[PDB]
Design a protein around this ligand. Structure first.
Ligand code: QA7
Length: 551
């Protein structure tokens, strides 16, 4: 059946709280390195991190924070954010990991979302940088409130160390983290759930203390805080941090950093690999030594086969091995990645990729050879990590067999406590028998997960759900329609290329399109809409990942 178990996981072994993790890390000689520019870096050993955290703890406790209070993080500096996080860990405070607003001058979507979480958490202290504190204080005017409370981190490092750490229990809440989506929800995790993912991820990837980590993704992203940062401290390995805006400005800096620091592992969503591919001209005029890289995780969004293979091809002359890319899938609600694929290879472009007939997406998937049209290719995302169970169910939540697209559900010890102060939302995701409803769509093959879409993308008609490729099919049925792409809109849109570019030929195929779909479906004819000088090397989906990501 479409049910895959990652194997047993000894969660009783190793550290049980994040305070133990920092202690075992403070005993090593490794630590963190913060990149500031091409010729400057700030270092902070794990032993030094522990000390700095105790100093900020003195400050936080001096502002009235008590064990269990939430703290609203608004940081631009990696050094301050990492230290604030571990100060809260020592004091038992609960950080709220959310990104900083693009601008604090005007009322934008980001500022409204910050207000929602700030109000939901009952006006917690906002912890900030010296660089950002000037902007964050402007929220008092945008929010029209007198309860705003802000404080910077740098002045707190000049205090003595408070070595009286609040004794934490595994089930205690460790931090909040905001999702993407309307208003964002507030995911609440515990020491036990985050550590279960760390321990499962270390076992699956064979991470060790000898790794050298490089990450420029935000720490307010679950993959930045758990999959990498906390994994790095749990293994005690060396980790290097860079600012996200520095990569977006000059993507090739990712290659400089990997070479500069001889990094062995890094990650990014698919758009970052595509951004690098756009620099093929300068990549062929540069020089990098990437022979140390062994793990390039690709996750957080759809992993495009053409993207990762062009990536491996461009960087081969610079020493990048052909098996370093590891597609992965995860969510904030399950404390980051729960599957990793180790099948991508430069030579064999079909390894770790599955191609099927488009006509089989609604039934048992029919394998097929890649073709100019009529087929679809998906990147396999791998088996579940130890301790995780994945299954695929239909719209009645019944178990499906493999090679059938369905609703992805997760069961394991990495699952959140739940959305904060939203019993209703928790009921929708927490199904009976301990299954978490991801909202994603995919299938299982040989125990390996592959995502194909999201419930959010389905279209409801007559009180029943349908896929965009189901509607597109009835349109291709119409004579004179070569191919078609649909896009549901709010006051149905159907693009189609005609077999013959001739007016009355195009007008008749357009009529039968608006009519045939209007009769195969119980919808008004008016609702359906048929429609009919430069070349771009970048893929269409990949170019949308870049625009959405940069903005
Ligand atoms: C690798 C992980 C650290 C990613 C993660 O943990 C995160 O992305 O946290 P987030 O809660 O913000 O979003 C979760 C939503 O991202 C989507 N998603 C993630 N990985 C994907 C993939 N490999 N292919 C297609 N979609 C993917 C999915 O819809 C999911 O439900």
């Amino acid at each position: 059946p479409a049910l895959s178990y990652g194997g047993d996981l000894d969660v009783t072994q190793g550290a049980q709280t994040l305070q133990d993790v920092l202690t075992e890390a403070a005993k090593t000689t490794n630590g963190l390195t913060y990149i500031v520019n091409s010729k400057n870096e700030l270092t902070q050993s794990y032993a030094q991190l522990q000390g700095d955290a105790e100093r900020v703890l003195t400050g936080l406790r001096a502002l009235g924070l008590k064990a269990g209070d939430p703290v609203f993080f608004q940081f631009s500096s990696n050094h301050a954010m990492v230290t604030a996080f571990w100060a809260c860990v020592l004091g038992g405070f609960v950080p709220t990991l959310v990104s900083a607003a693009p601008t604090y001058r005007e009322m934008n979507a980001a500022v409204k979302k910050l207000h929602h979480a700030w109000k939901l958490l009952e006006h917690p202290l906002i912890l900030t940088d010296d660089s950002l504190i000037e902007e964050v204080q402007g929220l008092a005017f945008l929010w029209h409130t007198d309860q705003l409370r802000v404080a910077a981190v740098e002045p707190m490092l000049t205090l003595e160390r408070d070595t009286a750490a609040h004794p934490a229990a595994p089930d205690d809440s460790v931090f909040f983290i905001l999702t993407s989506g309307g208003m964002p929800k507030c995911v609440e995790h515990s020491h036990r759930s985050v550590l279960a993912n760390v321990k499962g991820t270390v076992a699956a990837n064979q991470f060790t203390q000898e790794d050298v980590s490089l990450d420029w993704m935000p720490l307010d992203h679950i993959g930045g805080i758990v999959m990498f940062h906390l994994v790095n401290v749990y293994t005690g390995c060396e980790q290097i941090r860079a600012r996200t805006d520095d990569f977006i400005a000059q993507p090739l800096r990712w290659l400089d950093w990997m070479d500069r620091y001889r990094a062995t592992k890094t990650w990014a969503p698919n758009f970052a690999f595509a951004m690098i591919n756009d620099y093929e001209k300068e990549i062929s005029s540069g020089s990098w030594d990437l022979s140390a890289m062994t793990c390039m995780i690709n996750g957080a969004e759809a992993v495009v086969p053409k993207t990762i293979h062009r990536f491996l091809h461009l960087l081969a002359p610079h020493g990048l091995k052909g098996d370093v890319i590891r597609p992965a899938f995860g969510m904030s609600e399950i404390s980051s990645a729960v599957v990793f694929s180790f099948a991508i290879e430069r030579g064999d472009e079909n390894s770790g990729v599955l191609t099927f007939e488009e006509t089989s997406l609604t039934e048992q998937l029919r394998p097929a050879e890649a073709r100019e049209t009529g087929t679809v290719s998906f990147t396999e995302l791998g088996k579940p990590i130890p301790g995780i169970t994945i299954r695929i169910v239909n719209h009645q939540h019944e178990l499906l067999p493999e090679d059938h697209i369905g609703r992805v559900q997760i069961k394991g010890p990495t699952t959140m406590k739940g959305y904060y102060r939203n019993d209703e939302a928790n009921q929708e995701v927490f199904q009976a028998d301990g299954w978490f409803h991801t909202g994603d769509l995919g299938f299982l093959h040989e125990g390996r997960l592959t995502l194909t879409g999201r419930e959010k993308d389905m279209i409801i008609i007559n009180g029943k759900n349908y896929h965009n490729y189901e509607i597109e099919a009835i349109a291709e049925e119409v004579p004179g329609v070569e191919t078609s792409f649909v896009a549901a809109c709010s006051v149905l849109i159907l693009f189609f290329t005609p077999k013959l570019y001739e007016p009355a030929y195009i007008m008749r195929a357009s009529q039968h399109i608006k009519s045939h779909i209007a009769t195969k479906m119980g919808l008004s004819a008016s609702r359906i809409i048929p429609v009919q000088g430069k070349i771009e090397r970048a893929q269409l989906k990949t170019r949308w990942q870049e625009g959405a990501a940069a903005e």
